[PDB]
Symmetry: C2
Subunit: 158 residues, 2 copies
Amino acid sequence: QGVNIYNISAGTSVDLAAPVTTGDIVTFFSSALNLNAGAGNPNNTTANLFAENGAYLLHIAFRLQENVIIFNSRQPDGPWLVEQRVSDVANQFAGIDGKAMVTVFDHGDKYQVVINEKTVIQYTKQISGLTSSLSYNATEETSIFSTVVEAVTYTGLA
Amino acid sequence: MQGVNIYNISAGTSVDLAAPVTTGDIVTFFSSALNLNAGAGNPNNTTANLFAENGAYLLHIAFRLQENVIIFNSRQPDGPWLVEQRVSDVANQFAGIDGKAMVTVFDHGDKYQVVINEKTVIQYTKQISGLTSSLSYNATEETSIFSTVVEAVTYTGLA
């Protein structure tokens, strides 16, 4: 088992030293939570897990104006697949202020997404494979998270 | 089912877990500070602990700046400390990251794997087994190597 820490600046991606596969965990830690940021474009913040070929295994997008969290997948060159949505962004982060956590458990057939202690969705995968990269995309002007998000992975668990 | 539990532990206090930590689970203590020049411990500057339901120290992690060592031990509820394990050079274990730190403990059933940031500092073979039902972060606000409040995050139901 191993722990790897990644400091992801908004709008950048990072290659994992240890891949995230079935049974592994990744948590994105934000040192802030601004639910008063302007409207997204259309997204305020997104956190992604990528396969080796660049496919979006899991795309999580936070939209304040549409008051929704979107979950989807996409082939590197393909179009967004079947979009999953969950309403009320504020409610998902309820309980903890000034910071937040977004954890993704890779259960093989699904990705379990948890905001702080709340499981927001049991996402049935649309694309499978190990996660080799991660990204945090947003602007300094409208992101709901801190300018740098710390991603921590716990691997070798299985 | 797998779950995430968040606990804010103020220096010198303990918390009872909503979900116990057992084989295959993980606990990580997050500190928003790192003071390798804190006062003199007596002898501990900071300790992070995992307890069984009966009060036993499943794992006692003590950071000592002056003795420059991190100690690992266990003890039954009202018994003597058992066989101590040592890791010399505190600063070295936290090398690479400043201003903060994290201490992760993997419960591997037969051993506790302790990792400081990304570095595994010890494969601690348990002297006492059982589920972890409480955690503690002990220190004075003046001589702790960590922040006044440490955030413990547990990942459970993994197995």
